[PDB]
Amino acid sequence: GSPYTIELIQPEDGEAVIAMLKTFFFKDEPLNTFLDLGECKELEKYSLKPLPDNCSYKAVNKKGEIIGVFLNGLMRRPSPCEHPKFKKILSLMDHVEEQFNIFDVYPDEELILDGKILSVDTNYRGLGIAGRLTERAYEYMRENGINVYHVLCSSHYSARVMEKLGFHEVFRMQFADYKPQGEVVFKPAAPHVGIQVMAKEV
Numbered sequence: 409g410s411p412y413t414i415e416l417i418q419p420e421d422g423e424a425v426i427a428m429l430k431t432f433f434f435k436d437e438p439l440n441t442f443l444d445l446g447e448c449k450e451l452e453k454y455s456l457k458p459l460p461d462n463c464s465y466k467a468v469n470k471k472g473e474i475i476g477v478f479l480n481g482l483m484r485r486p487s488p489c490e491h492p493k494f495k496k497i498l499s500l501m502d503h504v505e506e507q508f509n510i511f512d513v514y515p516d517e518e519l520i521l522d523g524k525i526l527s528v529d530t531n532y533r534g535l536g537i538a539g540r541l542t543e544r545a546y547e548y549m550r551e552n553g554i555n556v557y558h559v560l561c562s563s564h565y566s567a568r569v570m571e572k573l574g575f576h577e578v579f580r581m582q583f584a585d586y587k588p589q590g591e592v593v594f595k596p597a598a599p600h601v602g603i604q605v606m607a608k609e610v
């Protein structure tokens with residue numbers, strides 16, 4: 409009996425979204441937790457960047473507070489940062505993109521939807537809000553003729569959200585195996601075993 413709405417995130421929402429992410433995602437996404445991310449303007453800018461694509465969604469409670477967000481942006485088929493902790497995360501994301509091209513799985517797709525930042529207020533977890541946020545994007549995909557939803561998960565819990573919705577894990581990289589320059593960079597808490605790249609054909 410905790411009602412909420414699912415709404416498109418507007419440009420004026422940037423501040424509220426960042427406030428929520430700082431309380432939750434910035435502290436409790438597993439890589440951020442492992443590194444103890446702290447203040448990070450670069451992740452703020454990173455989070456705001458896809459908003460103008462108009463396919464990022466917020467869950468809002470009966471008090472008008474944001475209790476969940478899924479920030480998404482369009483991702484195109486490829487063709488030929490001072491914050492020292494976020495730099496490591498960014499390098500990991502570059503690395504995955506170097507080792508796995510989602511577009512090889514979908515050779516006839518030019519544009520796909522990329523699920524970038526997913527966060528739900530701890531008090532409201534286990535109610536399927538992340539799933540509701542994810543499904544909302546299907547409406548956008550259908551309107552725009554987008555066929556694939558790609559979500560790189562750094563959490564076993566977000567991977568579970570995607571699995572319930574019928575996403576399949578098309579690439580796994582275990583953190584224990586990520587050793588750029590020969591040494592382990594990340595050792596997040598179990599059950600977060602690795603990067604789980606999830607894809608749905610909607």
Ligand SMILES: CC(C)(COP(=O)(O)OP(=O)(O)OC[C@H]1O[C@@H](n2cnc3c(N)ncnc32)[C@H](O)[C@@H]1OP(=O)(O)O)[C@@H](O)C(=O)NCCC(=O)NCCS
Nearest residue numbers: 436437526527528533534535536537538561562563565566
């Ligand atoms: C990942 C996250 C967005 C899921 O949101 P959610 O709305 O709770 O999603 P769900 O209700 O489907 O729960 C997913 C799974 O989380 C697990 N979970 C972790 N903590 C939980 C808790 N406090 N309450 C209930 N379930 C929890 C459960 O295994 C659950 O599976 P199940 O309910 O089907 O048995 C949320 O856990 C979160 O914000 N985590 C921290 C930030 C993060 O890791 N983001 C994703 C990085 S890719």
Ligand SMILES: [NH3+]CCc1ccccc1
Nearest residue numbers: 437439497524560561562
């Ligand atoms: N998709 C999750 C990856 C991630 C982890 C931490 C900061 C930004 C992005």
